[PDB]
Design a binder for this molecule. Structure first.
Ligand SMILES: [Ca+2]
Ligand SMILES: [Ca+2]
Ligand SMILES: [Ca+2]
Ligand SMILES: [Ca+2]
Lengths: 142, 27
């Protein structure tokens, strides 16, 4: 993996590391999962950590996180996080994100919305003015 | 009053969702 790739995964790791101490605990994993609408049990959190806890000290450090992330990338069907994310938004895969597609992602992620907010979000990202957000515009905005 | 913050929050929430799935897909 390149240094830029390592940096991206550091960003991801930091979205979980609540205390910023360099490790992801079962409790931290659970907080993120709870925020996403999931309520895993303690043993469940323990197995998720265990499967990736290479040295077995009970928490996940960045090297272990990287091994996991690297394993995912080093696979034919795995794309870059940014591209994978764009595809979550662009469900019909035509390369453009519609208002309906944006409302769907926001709803799925528990983000409240109004039509005006959605229209301004698109407008702000819509550089070529075609009424939708293409990949290039998606990258620029994100 | 820019909308960039909402866009950025969605990306971050999705990135977290994908990492959780990765903890599950691992094998
Ligand atoms: Ca931590
Ligand atoms: Ca460990
Ligand atoms: Ca689309
Ligand atoms: Ca556009």
């Amino acid at each position: 993996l390149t240094e830029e790739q390592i940096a991206e995964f550091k960003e991801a790791f930091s979205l979980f590391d609540k205390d910023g101490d360099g490790t992801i605990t079962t409790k931290e994993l659970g907080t993120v999962m709870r925020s996403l609408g999931q309520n895993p049990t303690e043993a469940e959190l323990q197995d998720m950590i265990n499967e990736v806890d290479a040295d077995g000290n009970g928490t996940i450090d960045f090297p272990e996180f990287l091994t996991m992330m690297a394993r995912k990338m080093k696979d034919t069907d795995s794309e870059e996080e940014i591209r994978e994310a764009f595809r979550v938004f662009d469900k019909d895969g035509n390369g453009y994100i519609s208002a309906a597609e944006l409302r769907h992602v926001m709803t799925n992620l528990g983000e409240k919305l109004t039509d005006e907010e959605v229209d301004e979000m698109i407008r702000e990202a819509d550089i070529d003015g075609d009424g939708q957000v293409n990949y290039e515009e998606f990258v620029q905005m994100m | 009053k820019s909308k960039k913050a909402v866009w950025h929050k969605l990306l971050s929430k999705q990135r977290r969702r994908a990492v959780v799935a990765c903890f599950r897909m691992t094998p």
